[PDB]
Chain A
Amino acid sequence: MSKRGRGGSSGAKFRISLGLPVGAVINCADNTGAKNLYIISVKGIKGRLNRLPAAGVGDMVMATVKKGKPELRKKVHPAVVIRQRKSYRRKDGVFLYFEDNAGVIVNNKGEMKGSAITGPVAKECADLWPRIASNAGSIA
């Protein structure tokens, strides 16, 4: 459980196949003016020799905006992955995967920088981050 703050859930997220290693450029699914998110580091990762930190849906990452509004660029943002293309198994045996990899820019408190989310938000991400689930259009 990487999330490290008060207000968590008695139930804990189960392990999900992670398909987005550091270096992944994922789409930005909010209306902040950023077009993509370039991962630079995943939160909670201790790792081992040679293993690139990797994230899945629900994982808070640190990302930089490579294309988008100029004031959002050239700085590090806390972002949360909401959609991934790597298929992952839920506990009910469903191997779910999305059309694109997507994230949203947030702050350390988990509150979301934007106001709306384009596309669906994974159920794993929605349960872990209430603020993102509030702004979600659909939960997949």
Chain B
Amino acid sequence: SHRKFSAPRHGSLGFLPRKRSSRHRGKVKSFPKDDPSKPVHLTAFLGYKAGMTHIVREVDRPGSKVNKKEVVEAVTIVETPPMVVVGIVGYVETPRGLRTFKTVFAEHISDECKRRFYKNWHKSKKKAFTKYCKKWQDEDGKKQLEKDFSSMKKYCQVIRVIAHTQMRLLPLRQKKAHLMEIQVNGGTVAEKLDWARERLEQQVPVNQVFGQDEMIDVIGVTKGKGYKGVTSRWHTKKLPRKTHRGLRKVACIGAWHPARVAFSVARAGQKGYHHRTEINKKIYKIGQGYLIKDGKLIKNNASTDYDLSDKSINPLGGFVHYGEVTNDFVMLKGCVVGTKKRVLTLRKSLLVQTKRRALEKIDLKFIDTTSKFGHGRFQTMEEKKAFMGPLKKDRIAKEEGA
């Protein structure tokens, strides 16, 4: 008989199976559609989730109760040191899909990128690309590479650059670089190859891929939770306390007929560590990395036009379980998938941004830098000393010194 009262189903069947992701790095399942009219440009970038703080900004939203009023908005800090282009890959449109036509790598490959090719770098001889690189010097190789570039020019319709992160600039134990293919949109295919050939072995900053006030998508692997019951995995109603045999369950996993458990019924298993693609994450700030100017170190990337404090995006005491953000970063509104230190794929929007929220221009007024390793009380090292004054350790240090 019919269920007495109507109720929505628990969970979405569009995210099945709820299995551990086959990949750790976020995968761009679809790149933005190519408009040859647009200038040649990359469509994606790789970043690392450092942590989250909150900001203060004035909202220009006519007709809203927060119009010309200041609000506090949580933001996520994604460390994005420049990526190095080490290869070009061409694709041909076939009646069976897109087929990898030809791959051409640059002459010089860093040990960061070369680590990606080895399960045990320590025990290896690091021979990868040692014979390939000679093609760029030998006369026979130079002609062969030029044949590849011309064939890619003549037959490929999709051109992508193979780029890798610089793990040496990040405060992580990992030194193996995450490599990914980034599609090159805009222009003709000939212009795509000319543009990509120049960028070979070069660095690409994040501000050449993304801009301020841009709605972008974040692709990555959610935080793993291990083996979970239906109550946590699918958020099914807990059974009464009197329930024998346990209550963190689903009572009826199906009718008598059909005589099989259906795929739509909530079951226990893996939760988290699922590949996901969240969209419309607005870029609030593209921060600059630490810079050395005429002898001194410039690190006031957390200063706004209204808070001229010389402080970095790093909270007092550093980002918890991540480290110190010294490279370029992107400040994204709201939260994103993944743990701290998780590599995130930043992709341009597949949609046309015309809503007022998407077209909003963000002007920051304050960036919170209080410690997140407890109840943060002071924005900077300086004002903590100014407020508290000298301590016992300070007296002893000045006593020992003089």
Contact residues in A for B335 (Cβ distance below 8 Å):
none
Residues of B126-143 whose CB lies within 8 A of A: none
Contact residues in B for A13 (Cβ distance below 8 Å):
65
B67 at the binding interface (Cβ < 8 Å): yes
A92 at the binding interface (Cβ < 8 Å): yes
Closest approach, in angstroms, between the C-beta of B2 and any C-beta of chain A?
A: 14
Find out whether the CB atom of B237 lies under 8 angstroms from the CB atom of A50.
yes
Complex: how many Å from CA A45 to CA B56?
A: 33
Closest approach, in angstroms, between the C-beta of B241 and any C-beta of chain A?
A: 15
Find out whether the CB atom of B8 lies under 8 angstroms from the CB atom of A92.
no
Find out whether the CB atom of A12 lies under 8 angstroms from the CB atom of B65.
yes
B98 at the binding interface (Cβ < 8 Å): no
Considering the complex, give the chain B residue whose CB is closest to the CB of A127.
Answer: B65
Closest approach, in angstroms, between the C-beta of A88 and any C-beta of chain B?
A: 14
Find out whether the CB atom of A49 lies under 8 angstroms from the CB atom of B7.
yes
Closest approach, in angstroms, between the C-beta of B266 and any C-beta of chain A?
A: 15
B94 at the binding interface (Cβ < 8 Å): no
Closest approach, in angstroms, between the C-beta of A6 and any C-beta of chain B?
A: 17
Contact residues in B for A48 (Cβ distance below 8 Å):
7-8
Complex: how many Å from CA A49 to CA B237?
A: 10
Closest approach, in angstroms, between the C-beta of B86 and any C-beta of chain A?
A: 44
Find out whether the CB atom of B65 lies under 8 angstroms from the CB atom of A92.
no
Find out whether the CB atom of B71 lies under 8 angstroms from the CB atom of A49.
no
Find out whether the CB atom of B8 lies under 8 angstroms from the CB atom of A91.
no
Contact residues in A for B66 (Cβ distance below 8 Å):
91
Closest approach, in angstroms, between the C-beta of B333 and any C-beta of chain A?
A: 14
B256 at the binding interface (Cβ < 8 Å): no
Residues of A1-17 whose CB lies within 8 A of B: 9-14
Considering the complex, give the chain A residue whose CB is closest to the CB of B61.
Answer: A11
Complex: how many Å from CA A13 to CA B70?
A: 16
Find out whether the CB atom of B54 lies under 8 angstroms from the CB atom of A14.
no
CB contact under 8 A between A93 and B54, given known A48-B8, A49-B5, A50-B237: yes
Closest approach, in angstroms, between the C-beta of B135 and any C-beta of chain A?
A: 58
Find out whether the CB atom of B71 lies under 8 angstroms from the CB atom of A92.
yes
Closest approach, in angstroms, between the C-beta of A126 and any C-beta of chain B?
A: 12
Residues of B29-45 whose CB lies within 8 A of A: none
Find out whether the CB atom of A92 lies under 8 angstroms from the CB atom of B69.
yes
Contact residues in B for A12 (Cβ distance below 8 Å):
64-65
Closest approach, in angstroms, between the C-beta of B11 and any C-beta of chain A?
A: 15
Complex: how many Å from CA A92 to CA B64?
A: 14
Closest approach, in angstroms, between the C-beta of B370 and any C-beta of chain A?
A: 13
B374 at the binding interface (Cβ < 8 Å): no
Contact residues in A for B72 (Cβ distance below 8 Å):
91-93
Closest approach, in angstroms, between the C-beta of A10 and any C-beta of chain B?
A: 5
Considering the complex, give the chain A residue whose CB is closest to the CB of B63.
Answer: A10
Considering the complex, give the chain B residue whose CB is closest to the CB of A11.
Answer: B65
Find out whether the CB atom of A11 lies under 8 angstroms from the CB atom of B63.
yes
Considering the complex, give the chain A residue whose CB is closest to the CB of B4.
Answer: A49
Name which of A10, A48, A50, A91 has the most chain B CB atoms within 10 A of its CB.
A91
Closest approach, in angstroms, between the C-beta of B265 and any C-beta of chain A?
A: 18
Complex: how many Å from CA A91 to CA B56?
A: 10
Complex: how many Å from CA A12 to CA B64?
A: 7
Complex: how many Å from CA A92 to CA B54?
A: 11
Considering the complex, give the chain A residue whose CB is closest to the CB of B71.
Answer: A91
Some 14 contacts from A to B, beta carbons below 8 A apart, are: A9-B65, A10-B63, A48-B7, A48-B8, A49-B6, A49-B7, A91-B65, A91-B69, A92-B70, A92-B71, A93-B54, A93-B71, A93-B72, A127-B65
The 5 closest A-B pairs by CB, nearest first: A93-B72, A11-B65, A49-B7, A91-B71, A10-B63
- Residue numbers of A with Cβ under 8 A of B are 9-14, 48-50, 91-93, 127
